[PDB]
């Protein structure tokens, strides 16, 4: 799949492959071409690093294309989310660990080891290499324009280690606030206005009643996705023993990442009791 990237939200979060977690489409598409075809200090330090750079440079390239060559925050976050997954793969915390990823894990184990002391060497190797992998993902974005280049994306913000489930809630919440206005804008067009003099269009108008079943189907996947992701967060936070600086509930992660995040409305939105939804899709 190191060819091109499916359009944003062409495919939603996959909560079925592994039942305990939802996986975003970007994680599947993560380019691991060279990292699989690998079949002695130089075994890891020089060779494995080059292989990971060749993959990171591609990911950083197709992600720039995914974002229509826009050099904005939406692009930097795709870099941040993907660079982390590269790390969880190296550090043995890849939550998916399915299919082609199983080959990469076996490749890394035949390099570092298999015991507890191997994760440390791998976690250490990621720390002393994560910076260089970020410069690789920024390759295409930096080659493209020799001049006029700016460090829009920042390094330490991307190489800050954080449990994988955290960074996926960040990506999810960013997808939710982008999708909600759309599913509402569609609802507004077909349901605004009053039908006769005081009744709502959804009571009788099929066109409006249909846009509601589309939103009803969408918001239900969001509620369910939030349920799984927040439960998987509680399982990890309880098992890690690290304080991760001010995050207790998964709602804190959205407050940090989202601007003007009103979790009161968020709870209302995903539970179909918000204001706009009642005015448009609830008759009585």
């Amino acid at each position, epitope marked *: 799949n190191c060819n091109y990237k499916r359009k944003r939200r062409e495919r939603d979060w996959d909560c079925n492959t592994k039942k305990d977690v939802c996986i975003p489409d970007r994680r599947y598409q993560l380019c691991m071409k060279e990292l699989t075809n690998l079949v002695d200090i130089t075994f890891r330090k020089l060779y494995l690093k080059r292989k990971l750079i*060749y993959d990171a440079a591609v990911e950083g390239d197709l992600l720039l294309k995914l974002n229509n060559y826009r050099y904005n925050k939406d692009f930097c976050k795709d870099i941040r989310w993907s660079l982390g997954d590269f790390g969880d793969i190296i550090m043995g915390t890849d939550m998916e660990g399915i299919g082609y990823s199983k080959v990469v894990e076996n490749n890394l184990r035949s390099i570092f080891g298999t015991d507890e002391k191997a994760q440390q060497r791998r976690k250490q190797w990621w720390n002393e290499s994560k910076a260089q992998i970020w410069t690789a993902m920024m*390759y295409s974005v*930096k080659k493209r324009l020799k*001049g006029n280049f700016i460090w829009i994306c920042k390094l330490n913000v991307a190489v800050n280690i954080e449990p994988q489930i955290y960074r996926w809630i960040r990506e999810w919440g960013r997808d939710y606030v982008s999708e909600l206005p759309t599913e509402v804008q569609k609802l507004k067009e077909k349901c605004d206005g009053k039908i006769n003099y005081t009744d709502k269009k959804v009571c009788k108008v099929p066109p409006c009643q249909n846009a509601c079943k589309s939103y009803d189907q969408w918001i239900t996947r969001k509620k369910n996705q939030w349920d799984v992701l927040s439960n998987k967060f509680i399982s990890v936070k309880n098992a890690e023993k690290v304080q991760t600086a001010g995050i207790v509930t998964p709602y804190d992660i959205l407050k940090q990442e989202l601007d003007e995040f009103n979790e009161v409305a968020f709870e209302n939105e995903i539970n179909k009791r918000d204001g706009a939804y009642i005015e448009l899709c609830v008759c009585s």
Partner: single-chain antibody
Amino acid sequence: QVQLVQSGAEVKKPGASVKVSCKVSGYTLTELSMHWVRQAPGKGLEWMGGFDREDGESIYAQKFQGRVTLTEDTSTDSVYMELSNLRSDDTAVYFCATDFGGSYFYAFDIWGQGTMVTVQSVLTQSPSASGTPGQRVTISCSGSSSNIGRNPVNWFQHLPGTAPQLLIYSNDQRPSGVPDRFSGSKSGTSASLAISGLQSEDEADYYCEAWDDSLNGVVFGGGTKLT
């Protein structure tokens, strides 16, 4: 706008030393790698060394490790490369070039104008090619699996008199200014450049470049000239 300006032509006596400058203009030197390559009048392009900034610890070619020393001066925003024990066959034109965004990549982007100094290869290309306006031509590059097999390939359009320019990188991708008629491909142990619709601006010698895992250095091909 990012320029590289080198020092004037120098003439030395066999056995002496020579120091060439290379100044950046339009971007902080502190981020670039600043490699160097030379080309004798009769021979082709050869890579000497460079400063791998991501790791420090500059690297050099094989039978050059005892003659080249790269220095730097952040105040003057320039790089210096010194050659000692100058032999008669070291007469050539010396270039400084960088990838500008590469960590372990060598798809050079910004080249200097060269410096005239007066005192085979792992990759194998076809000795020469020839074509007529409007046809497809295919220059091929062939090497072992330790240089082209497991690493990306680049292509260069060098017009003698001027400095080479990046034509293709990562075996498939073309820069902005490169025409759409150019295109690259790689498979197994051989890459190939393709010019769909040979026009008049093909008056150049074409080289392929890749990274050799066994040599730990940048290697160039023999060369190929179209007409």
